[PDB]
Amino acid sequence: ELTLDPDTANPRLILSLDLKGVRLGERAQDLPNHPCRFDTNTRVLASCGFSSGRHHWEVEVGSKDGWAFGVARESVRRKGLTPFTPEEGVWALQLNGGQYWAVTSPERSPLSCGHLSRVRVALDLEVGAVSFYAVEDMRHLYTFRVNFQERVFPLFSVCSTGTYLRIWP
């Protein structure tokens, strides 16, 4: 079962005791500045990364703005303020401005998917794709087709208070 990796987490994030949930806190924790820790962007990775095969996990999503989640290439930049874009190696859905988005670039792609509660992520490192489905009916939300060239990690980001993400098993 997937858990969030506290050594990668931006020190403003608050992880749940069971390491499944993340929200944004009001104060930066005093944590060691490991090279793998996101020091500015509000991100955390799961402790498990994948180099081959096909993998599923599910993410319970808050109803309000502030979250983005999906996958990141391991080489995603951790230090300084970085763009949240496919070019930086993040492939994600996002709730922002009251709208669900696939975070394409240079312009995001608005999704007309209706309300989301929990999303199944399907990562395929054999063919090269990451897909998102709303669990109530498995309707397709978005697929990024990517020739991944390194290990890929589940990615979570929460940039405002009042929302959350939770790995659901």
């Binding site: 502030g66 303020l81 949240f84 922002n96 401005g97 940039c159």
Partner: peptide, 7 residues
Amino acid sequence: CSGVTFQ
């Protein structure tokens, strides 16, 4: 002020 710059 959504904070999305820091996503």
